[PDB]
Each structure stands twice: as structure tokens, then as C-alpha cells.
Amino acid sequence: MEQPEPDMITIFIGTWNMGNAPPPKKITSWFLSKGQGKTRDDSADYIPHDIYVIGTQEDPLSEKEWLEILKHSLQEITSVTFKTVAIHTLWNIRIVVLAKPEHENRISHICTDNVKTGIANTLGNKGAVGVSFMFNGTSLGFVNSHLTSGSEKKLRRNQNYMNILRFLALGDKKLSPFNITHRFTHLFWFGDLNYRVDLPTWEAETIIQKIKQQQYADLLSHDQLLTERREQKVFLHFEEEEITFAPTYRFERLTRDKYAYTKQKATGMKYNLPSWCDRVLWKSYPLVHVVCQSYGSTSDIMTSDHSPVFATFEAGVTSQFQGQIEFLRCYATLKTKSQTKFYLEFHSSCLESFVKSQEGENEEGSEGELVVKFGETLPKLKPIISDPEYLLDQHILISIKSSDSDESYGEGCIALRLEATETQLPIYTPLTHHGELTGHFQGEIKLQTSQ
Ligand SMILES: *CCC(=O)c1nc(C#N)ccc1N1CCCOCC1
């Protein structure tokens, strides 16, 4: 019978700060998405995901021991003997990628990297590990980060984020102007991000009462990560599924009935109010299928002062295998105050190589911003394949560069998934540089396929 290539895979993301302690004997609940929150129904337990990505922090095991525990747990659940795709460890921060044996011919171009984020490196043990690879014609990226601890240190966590984003080297190195937040069709970023609930310590019993009544709304409105995301300080244009599970930190170990939030010598005389430290976020190219099917925490794995967190995703993928991409009325708006002239660069695997535009025309925006107008002067891109079943599924990455310095001042992405061809249609992408919002790009596009 026919052997189609998949257009959709399911991905499991797990993040667990193990608190430097060996795991219990049974951790199957983690991979089954069993516990609290948006959980997975019993009926699906025997259905294996295509890829399992496991991030740990404060992991005390050797790679061989953890790999053993993980494969046994997955065999218990699925019968399948998963292949190791990659495993990479920095200090006690670790990422494991496992995949169905039937996908081993579909996965290629595997890379790993890590970034240390310390004020004295050798002093702190924080940072990130990552893995990227191609699944057929889709690029995938995964980042597991352990950010700075402490309720008062949200600015340091934001800096950690920004440094991992800028310096982690994954994916297609030909995408020179782009950092990991634009190099992948799907990017998953997870870990002990260490953001806390910002409420007074003397409120701790009130917080616990709310957790016991499962009213998280008031607590989540004080979550540092959601606040900093809303204020565009971190994780620009990422998504996160609604949190519907209790805070995953800080628990008394060996039970799940006590939040150990008070100060004591072991914690440096610091409070650890209940917090959603452990998180999974994602960022996918526009108009690519991605749906979160579970996001929650386990209840029965109690060896750490964190509970494990799980999330699962359906993610759209593509495979192997005149045309013209025209831009009209295009312009960028930039927060910059540089007086340089700016040009555009277009990158895409539908192109034989990236295309460089001529410089735009500068003018002062209404609100005192810089407006760079390109008009109908932009190059007409000639894709290597004209079939609309292929071209409509592609994306064009855009970098706006200084002609004085050749550095990018902003990066974004445009989907070719259009409602019409040979027709002018509006396009838009925000622009970020080094992970911060720097402007916007808008205009019209006209796509020609073979029809
Ligand atoms: C090490 C990165 C790598 O092998 C790679 N990864 C992706 C993704 N996702 C796509 C392409 C590539 N290669 C190898 C190195 C980068 O430049 C050429 C393409």
C-alpha cells in the first residue's frame, strides 16, 4: 500500500528540574500527559508520539543511565524501541531527542549547541542546551534553558534569555542575519525558566488557599513570565498554552501535598512562593499548522522539589518537491535613530540563494519613527519550483540591513500561503533584532505559480 510522507507529526516536550536527585522507578505519567492541567485522555495512552524531546535541569544522572530510564519508560507505554536522535549536556542541563524508528530516514542535519549565562560562568551553572534537525523538508529547533533563580531576579532572567537567543548556534548557518527565533519552521523553548509569582511573602497562605481551590487566574495575573511577555521584554511573538495546573515549584520532596515556601538555611534564607517555574513555549512560521494538545504537570513523581511538566503538539511538516514573487507598496518602520540607508535581504529554500535589494527611501513617520519606503523597486524573486502545491507552503525571511554597517536592524517572516495568485494582497511581519521588537514591515505581494 501507498507510503505517503506525513504532513503532520506529534511532538512531546517535557521539562523537569530533578533537584539533583535520582528519579523514582515509574515516570510513565510524564510521557502519558497524566496529572493536572490540560491532560491527555486514557484512550490515547497506547498512541506513541513521533518525537519525544526531554529537557532536564539539576540532572544528576549520567547520559547512559537517563537514556536507559527514558527508553524503558517509553517501551512500557508503546512497545516501541525509540531511536536516539541527539543528546547534549551542559553541566546538569540536558536535552534528549527520541524518535520513532520509522522516521530515521526522515531526520537529517542534526546539530547541538549550548550557551552559558553566568556572571562568573565557573560560578553559576545556568544556561541552555539546544538541538535542531530537519524532518523531511521542515526545520525543527528545541531549546532547554535553566535561567537565573530568585524572585527578585526577573531582569537577570530576561538578560539570560536574550543572551541564549543571540548566541545559540543551531540550524542552517546560511541564514546569517537570523537568530534561532527565525531559523526554524517550529521552535520549542522550554525549561526551568525560574519566573515566579510576584505577590508578597506574607500572602503565602492566601496563595495556597487559591491553589487548593484551583483558582489560578489571580495568581497567573502576577506571574512574572506572562507579565514580561505582555510587556515585550522576553519571548517576543512566542505562544504558550493556557496554564490550568498548579504551580510546579517549590514542593516538599517525597509528597505533593506541601509547598515548601518558607526561608531556611538551605535556601539561603529566601522565600520560594509557589511559582510556575517550568514552562514550554513555541514559535512557528506564520500559517503553519501547530496545535497544543496537552500542557500540564504530573502528580506522582515526587523525588524533586519541582514537578515535571509535559506538553504535546501536532506540528505540520512538508517533504521533497515561471514562478515569480512580486512585492509592491512595501515599507518598513523602525524605532532606530540611525541615519543610514537601509536595504532588504530575502532568504528562503525556494530560492537558489538569498536576494539583496537596493536601498530604500527614508522619511519621518507620523509619530516620529523612521519609515523606509521601497515602492515597486524591489527585486522580483524567482523561485526554483513554480508548482502552487509547493510554493504556497513556503516562507520568505526578510532582514532589513544598514548599508553603512551591513548589520541587520530587524528580521521577520512572510508566508506564501495566500488566498489568491496573480493578485495583489497585503503582507505584514513585525521586525525583531537580537530578540527585541525594532519595527514592522508591510506592503503587498503578488504570487505567480504555474497554476
Ligand atoms: C549544523 C546545522 C545543520 O546541519 C543544518 N540544519 C538545518 C536545520 N534545521 C538546515 C541545514 C543545515 N545545513 C548544515 C549546516 C548549515 O548550512 C547548510 C545546511
Give residue 392 CA to ligand 1 midpoint distance, Å.
23
Q: Which of 109, 188, 347 to mutate to test the pocket of ligand 1 (most atoms within 8 A of CB)?
A: 109
Q: What is d(CA 238, CA 160) in angstroms, rounded to the nearest whole number?
A: 17
Q: What is d(CA 142, CA 340) in angstroms, rounded to the nearest whole number?
A: 36
Domains of the chain and any CATH numbers: 4-321 (3.60.10.10), 322-450 (no CATH)
| Degrees to nearest 5, angle at CA 113 with 109 and 117 | 160
**How many helices (DSSP H) and strands (DSSP E) are in the chain?**
8, 21
Q: Is 323 in the pocket of ligand 1 (CB under 6 A)?
A: no
Q: What is d(CA 89, CA 149) in angstroms, rounded to the nearest whole number?
A: 20
Q: How many CB atoms lie within 10 A of CB 256?
A: 18
- Tell me if 35 sits within 8 A of 296, measured CB to CB: yes
Neighbour-count burial of 200, counting CB atoms closer than 10 A to its CB (0-12 exposed, 13-18 middle, 19+ buried):
exposed
- Residue located nearest, by CA, to atom 8 of ligand 1: 171
118-140 burial, b if ≥16 CB within 10 A, otherwise e?
eeeeeebbbbbbbbbbbbbbbbb
- Cα→Cα distances 378→46, 77, 330, 344, 400, Å: 53, 54, 8, 9, 13
Q: What is d(CA 281, CA 382) in angstroms, rounded to the nearest whole number?
A: 35
Give the 3-state secondary structure of residue 145: strand
Beta bridge partners of 311: 13, 295
Nearest to 283 by CA among 395, 449, 200, 150: 395
- Residue located nearest, by CA, to atom 13 of ligand 1: 172
Q: Is 172 in the pocket of ligand 1 (CB under 6 A)?
A: yes
Give residue 325 CA to ligand 1 midpoint distance, Å.
25
Q: What secondary structure does DSSP assign to 43-102, as a single string? A: GGTT---SEEEEEEES--S-HHHHHHHHHHHHHHHHS--PEEEEEEEETTEEEEEEE-GG
**Overall resolution, Å:** 1.9
Q: What is d(CA 380, CA 337) in angstroms, rounded to the nearest whole number?
A: 30
- Tell me if 80 sits within 8 A of 51, measured CB to CB: no
Q: What is d(CA 75, CA 73) in angstroms, rounded to the nearest whole number?
A: 6
